[model samples]
Target: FNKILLRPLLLKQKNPENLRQLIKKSFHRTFDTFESLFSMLRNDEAFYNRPEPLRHPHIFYFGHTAVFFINKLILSKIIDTRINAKMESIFAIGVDEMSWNDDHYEWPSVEETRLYRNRVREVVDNLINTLPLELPITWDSPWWIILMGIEHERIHIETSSVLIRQTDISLVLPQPEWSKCNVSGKAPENELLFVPGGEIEIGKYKSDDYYGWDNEYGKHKTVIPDFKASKYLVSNGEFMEFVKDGGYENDLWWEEEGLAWRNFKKAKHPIFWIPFKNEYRYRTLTEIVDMPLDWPVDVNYHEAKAFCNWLSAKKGKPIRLPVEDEWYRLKEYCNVPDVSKWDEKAPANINLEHYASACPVTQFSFGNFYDVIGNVWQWTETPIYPFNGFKIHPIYDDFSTPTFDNRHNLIKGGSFISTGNEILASSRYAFRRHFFQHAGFRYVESSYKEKINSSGYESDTQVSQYCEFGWGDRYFGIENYPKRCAKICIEVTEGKPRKKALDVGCAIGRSTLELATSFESVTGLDFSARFIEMAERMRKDGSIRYTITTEGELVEYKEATLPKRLAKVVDRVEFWQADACNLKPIFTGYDLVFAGNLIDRLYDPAKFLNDIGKRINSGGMLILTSPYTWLEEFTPKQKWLGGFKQDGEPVKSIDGLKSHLKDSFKLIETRDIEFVIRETARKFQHSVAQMSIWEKILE
Candidate 1:
């Protein structure tokens, strides 16, 4: 039996010992499969080569997966011991390309990490055999932590394979365990087939028979309108036409951000494509071979999107990527069965049952569709949004919250290497538009129905409260916080050049709109994508509606709109999702920078304050307003700017700010701004924010 083709273990079983044996087998298989992928590396030297600039060396990932078991088990209190504390801390966090840091660290040797993994395996196996058992393993049960570690390693198996694929071909040697598809020929002609739309509900129950990630437990139901989808995944030969037609050179086909990426990377074709004059080749996991024109074209979301745009122009039809609901509709229409029901072999080219590389797109047939659930992940137009009743798993809280930002678009259907939880229909995985994996896309042609509706009211509790505080009715006769902050910015920079202004902590964009009235142009940026989306909606639609909690189980509906007086300047304002501490280089040359109620909430407030002066021009005004309600959850105590004693002397946030800013900025003015936030119908939060004005000294 092929252990690499193992399915997710069943959560419910009649006999506890039988279930333990089953879980034990799955755990060993998952761990060994993950370790086997690293065997492709030629030697120890290959492991140290940082192939992907955004990610750490192969050694980190090799150690990271093993460390996850210990870290998670320790958190759950299932195991109160540490295997290798140094390795665990070093391998705790993997890079997601959210921020850029190339700090050097003494990574442990591959041999050392390999030894650590052996100990982890022994420990985990002992626990599985020794831990008290129950009939049904539920979400809250301690056994769930054991399963979580196994499933997590399975995910890294696929992701790590991608990393190895990106490494230098010379660094990796092909193994008999992983082999590419031998079949290759002319690409199949893709045609649009009608998919009848119907109502579909996503997400699964917590007590589901199979294991799932936190994001898969929420419910989201929508009516997908009838649409036409491609008969097969886009093949390499199909995408070649776009490259020959100068698709990368033409900015018209790309979105604003996509164009920027194209310009930065100077990409002429897909990342895996190797062009030698006229003939093109493709890069597989451990080898580069002749172009597999019949195989699906692997690309990032941006490239896939540009291809769709070019097709739309060529066909004179609205060709676009399918939304999340539309993908579900197509899956249901094809009558694809879940993996648990499949026979000894997978029905599709997934679960590591097929060749290691993507096979021909035309080989797998599903009703009218060729590859509905496998071959490669299909990029969708939908940005991952939290479903109703969404709750984070306490053990892995950061799993879904970080992706709620609109930047990471969801990719549906598992890839050829996808297995375990990843292959599930309920599984939802997303990545940044520019990030790449073994992913392709199938376009859709609908009757001009927009996938995202940004005009809706905000419903998130924190977002709504900020919306009311920024644009909604005033509470307790106090002025709007965002508007008041903006007013101060305008008055302080009265004689300065108001050419461009940046609202660093713009929430729902009322401050951005206000800043635009005085400044020629304003850019609103927020760390939370939900807040930025709301801000963009209000800016574009002129109004937004949301429900605010009035009392227990009750709420009040409120509408916030852009003022007619500032309507003319609305076009000058733009909203973006950005990290304040690590802003993009393009955000410079600003005349004024305003941060409202943001400092205390940052993970590293001092880093932001110290670096922000570089973006502002000489003599530019910097306005900041914060309640100074510092909490350890938001910022580690050592990272905090103040609210503690230094050398037995009480220190304030203002003092800390002046110390960091003294070199590049001069304190010009200081004042107290009062605002009231409505928590509920009968409850309100009236707080005073310390407003400080600083002028950038001439460079």
Candidate 2:
């Protein structure tokens, strides 16, 4: 057998130099594993093929991980250079199976992506060797970015294998290193094993000895009710019974969401199961073989849910998937050791210590249970939610926030290919309910219902504040700033063309909708995905609710409903996530551009001012309103447009705006707008911004 996997790096090393060596080794191992995963593809041409319709081609993924390193490094200010900006931009997002309209990017050739990957490799290696090494690397430590890249690739190592398994057989080839488990026998009849109820704490702290993602760093504690869990993972043999009973044809067993997916896929069996002339075969990462009845069944959450519903009807007992807390309780009752405690091979069939494909569920035992922590990921009934103290990682903010939506369910344990931080007990991974992986579910005969709420009310302080600012009632008799700004735009351009408008920094889209009433159409763009998601939700649902801090640990719940007047033109407005400083090329030919309280927060205000004119039509208007609050945290000091002494003279922000927009337009009007923001019951911020309007010179 070949040893290709390494445990996650320990952050509490006694010697800094030794920790550095460990990090270097871990990085190369992860990189090599990722490369080899793609090597399973038959040739470079296969990299351009899309085995999974929702995912980008393998070429995008091959370059995506490398691009992640450079992008995060630049954001963290650890690197000032990029290997290839075009590749970085195209490969940066689109990992989720959201929509086809979100992406149709032209990808680089396999050879070109490979070269770019190598260049990224050298850059990371250089940084690891040169950066300062300190003990107890915490979440805020600069070294976390380095480990983020490593662990991120290790995640792809498993997901990419799943993609390869789905590719056409001729497009992939097997290697001995990724050998499948050859031992197979009859699957043991599974029964419910008693699991005692107890209190369990499920999150990691910032001072923990290992690295974790943002979702893993907060604290969540709960008491699990006594339950009965399956003795073994649901095996292919057990699931076959459901299929034989016409489970797919029965609507009584499936939920509304699961039934919709079943109808769309027209699925008769598990995705890995192949129908062969009245029989079934199975598909592995590289080869198809006789159906292994003993191996755990790989099915999505929907299929697992349907099977549980069917089993419950037959037994006349309450049965369903375990919630996240119940999964923790099961692990605690079994006394399964975390990967860090393993002295030899992994205690279960995980971390690539076993074969590439899942072995028989009967192969591993924990106390009275079998395959408690491995073989295949066991789906839980709970959707992913943040812990009490959860905060987004600044460098990778979107990692968990986007999944807070109820559409993604958490999967406990790990698959055969899971490695690095993934094998840790604290690892929390989730996916859409319809997504496929080396995943299955074990039934729990408990009637416990999870009560944690997620994706319902906006609780994040910053996001809630913006939500109130944009949509809530006027504060201190001051009109809603976004609405006021839109009113000014409409009044000034009374006789001019108002065809299309771009609302930059349109947090929560209050003004985007306001502008739609005047303009024929409007597009809202914001850098924060969290904000854009809320905006889009408001557009679709016509309402939003959030909690605003009134005092310490006390709050007021507020709901903002779209007005009846705005709803008339709501269909003409669309929301998108984008960086205003480097907007996509498609966001052009607008008659008006409204940037409210935005310029001062830009990383490069001068550049935004200069290039923005190109996006507007001749005789168009560039409207900006800013309090001119200059902060070094948001913008580098050297890049600040004003709030400094220039040769012993105070430089005003308006002077800087004039210098940048001079070539393309003339200043038409200026005015002062006052707004108030509520911070607490007793504290409020009242500020005045100077609104400047520039009209582009007509040809």
Candidate 3:
């Protein structure tokens, strides 16, 4: 096949057979391509080797996409159990450009990862064939989650290909499926081309006929200023001129951020370029080729931006990578058709139609431009910012939100290996500016200033409220609720076993950190991804800066920091997004389980109570504290455990807890605790909560 014909599903398709067939075919296409990526490894030793020190080894990449499917499926409640929980936890989150020297951990063997992949594949395949058929799957639909998994896997296909390219050339054995472009020669001289600016209306989704990532669906419209863009992507031949002129030696060309990154790594030239005996060579997926000067040079955003700055000084005109809107304007001016509109071989060197590697820069033309849609992803001046009305998908909420910080920059167009959803016009993907992929840049002649996100602080109201609740100061002379709760839990468990513990509904991680002081290890679980992400940030960076309400729609900024001992124990803590009522089976063997102010918020407290005993050890204790303000909005009337009339008699929450917990647990004591929540600088919520301690007797 000259070209892969796979595309993302348009859930609202009218035919049931077409929908089912598309789902199955997409699933197989991603699965097969993912398998082929591993063939770059010549032997088992190659799979465990880490090409880039910042990332996990090839073994983690091979198993990561498979675990993504299982994790999302289980969280969405499509499956009640997991194939391998330990493997999923280890391979769940692939490292995204961590430090050069990171903490070490053991990995399962290649054979075990392969076996787990097969198991996950079978589970997804069965669900596709037997699950009920429905057309036009909405974002909430179970079928939509299946599509998410497939597209997610497709993304890894390109990223892992880069990692494979970075590995030792001897370790990677080329296969027929992933061969390089055969043609490379002297590149054509590039020139600046004029592009008239217009309104680049992005995220205009009026179609049920396409699928999009969460960051691709918002309503964003902007009028771009006129700019002149490069006629071709910066070719290795063109960039060679800068290299000869000591482009890497001069620090004046680099910005502060780019300079810091360059100096820290002691980088001289593009990371992929190897200078040997006055000659240059570039690394491909499976081979080392003489410098492909005719092809676009693959570099990170830092190198690309520095080249533009050096050129700008020589020409005396403002030169830089096009901002996202300006890139859209250029894309429109090139008259390039989007991915779905093509039925023949790909219109450009994209979507894996031409070659497994980048081809000559002048091979394809659109309007007056060359290789406008492919060869390598072009860097943009804009950092990744969510458009107006941006929202995260429920099941994979952390995917885009974590990238929303200004640290990551957007890359327009697609590379040779980019396929499926990535080839679509609305597809949006970004990476840390210092990170590398199959990416390059085309400079622009413009003076328009780019808007950058600044003042790194969480502004979301609910998130700020929890941040204040977790670590903020006391109000109305009431002691800190989380600190008090932790102290009480420690007092009750004094001289008892102190192994693994759990803090369900651990918003912002104050209680989780406190619990870890006494227990050997603590796992903080929260249903809201925002909370978990905040907790993760605080844990990693040692501090989290956020805004608090001081007046109506007014805010105050503050940063939260715990004691050094508290920060030191964070390595013993793990944060995960999970449902309190449907806890995973792997979350067992805990000596203590604390549910602080969590019961009233659960939709099915009775279910949680019934299933709680099994997760604790035989002589463990459970700590639950809540104001018992049972509201129908948080928990339905039928799902509520107490604080309501039953047969004309009042039922208290303490009695309800005892009734549901009588089988495996015995109530040891009940006490009252005072709490004050600050709504604003002037308003304070004074409330009293009931705390109950229980001991597991049967389990």
Candidate 4:
């Protein structure tokens, strides 16, 4: 019998040895598959050539998946060893195209990294065979983290394939293991078909055998009213009609944000289309072929939405992309056997059982619809939001708060190359509306009503507090803490080299912007993405809108537009999300490092002090402020900087600071600063924080 295509591991296997062997097989298959994709690169030279400029070079991704295993293992304390410390650190983080981009790093040679990958495989396999196991692997278990590492590598296997598809045709050669579809012709007429809707429930049980992302396990139920879905996915020939109709030329069919993105990109047609005079060709993973009119059109959400708008107007129907719930209803009607119950051969064009490229949309039939599960990811009208019982994984906090914003839209179904967890029915993957993948959409004409025009304004209390603290002024006559803090730094650092500064805890960037007014360049760093995104948005538009509380369930809308004073220097300031204790090496050589109310909230403040001094230049200033509120909730009692008895004597926070910083930093000055935060119209919290200034001295 042929080797079975790998699926997700089941959690409740009775035998430990069987479970161990299962994970071992999965680990090897996932690792080998990813390595095979890298072999598609024409040469070692191609690894550094980035097909897309917004992302890192392919070489960075080459090492990232391997490093992920080691990092997670360390976090779980399953292993306390390092193979190559510098290379490990270098490969640990990946570029998610968030608020920051680190493009100035040297990468290890492909040969060196390949050796690292080999050693990682050895280490993981050894552990899987040797580590003691239990009957049922549950969430957050050490055994589960190993599975996570394996599953995570599977995700990269597909993502890297997508990247290789984007690489120039010359440098990415085809392999026999990955072949394109041969069948292509005129597409069947896509028409409206009735799909009876019902209670569309999407969530998973914690005890379910399938490995799910944090977003998938929560409950989301809705009674989807009756709707009419497209018989087949939108095909190339069908989308060509929109192209000929000057769809990209006209702005009316596009939303405001979509229009802006369209114009900025200057896109005349779809991303993968290659035009040569009147004839157009399609660029598949390796080769360019004559326009495959029957294949599903790969497009971003904006393009998909634009196509839907054009069709809606032409047909005089309310045609739009099916929302997530509507998509679920269609899936249930189609009798799709989700990954767990799939037969020997995949029924749909997924799991690499079909072509590397999308086959003819007419080939796969599901009830009245066709290509229901694959061919390409179907873009939805749904914005991804957490279900009722959403919670963050302790090891991966960013995965929670990162996607809550309205920008990341959900894409159901899997692409032709989608494998492992991605092909599962419950997989909930989202991308920013402007991003591209092997994604397309099927339109639905329904009285399916939900406002797609989601307001982008934030109302979270932490966001509001920072919004007001950053720029809003309904205060008790105290100067804006951000501006005051900026002024104090400017006042103290006069005549010093104001080349570069670091706002170590700049939450939403008011202080970072203010510092830009004094310093030539400034970088604002925060660990939380929710905070970083707001700062990033503000930096881009020079204004951010959010809500401020008045009373319970009542709030006022406000936009914090930068005044000319703030706006003048906003362009020089950059915002990034990063942990202070373990930062990328490029963040160093700064003249001023401001830790704005940072220490008390750290997981390790002493470590931050010692690590940060290395990042500052000699004689550069390190300014810090805090109320010195010590809580075991933020830091372990043993790691707390102060607020505890030391041998029956009080160890003040200042004393703690001196002990940590005295070796490399000289205390310059200390002062008291007052600030106020209004929780509601009638309630406020006031606090006095101490600001301490220190200068880095000789090593």
Q: Which pairs of residues have clashing backbones in candidate 1? A: none
lDDT of 4 by residue, 253-273 (tens): 999889988988898999899
lDDT (Cα) of model 4 = 0.84
* Local lDDT at 420 for model 2: 85
lDDT by residue for model 2 over 185-251, one digit each (tens)?
Answer: 8877899999999787988877888889988977777776789999999999999999999999899
User: Which is superior by TM-score, 1 or 4?
Assistant: 1
- Best model number under lDDT: 2
- Clashing residue pairs for model 2: none
- The C-alpha TM-scores of every prediction are 0.68, 0.69, 0.67, 0.67
Clashes of each: 0, 0, 2, 0
Best-to-worst ranking by lDDT = 2, 1, 3, 4
lDDT of 1: 0.86
Which wins on lDDT, candidate 1 or candidate 3? 1
lDDT of 1 at 614: 83
Model 3: per-residue Cα lDDT over 151-240, one tens digit each: 888898899899898898889899888889988999778889999987778883635467778778766666767889999999999998
For model 3 the local lDDT of residue 7 reads 58
TM-score of 2: 0.69
- C-alpha displacement of 202 in model 4, angstroms? 1.5
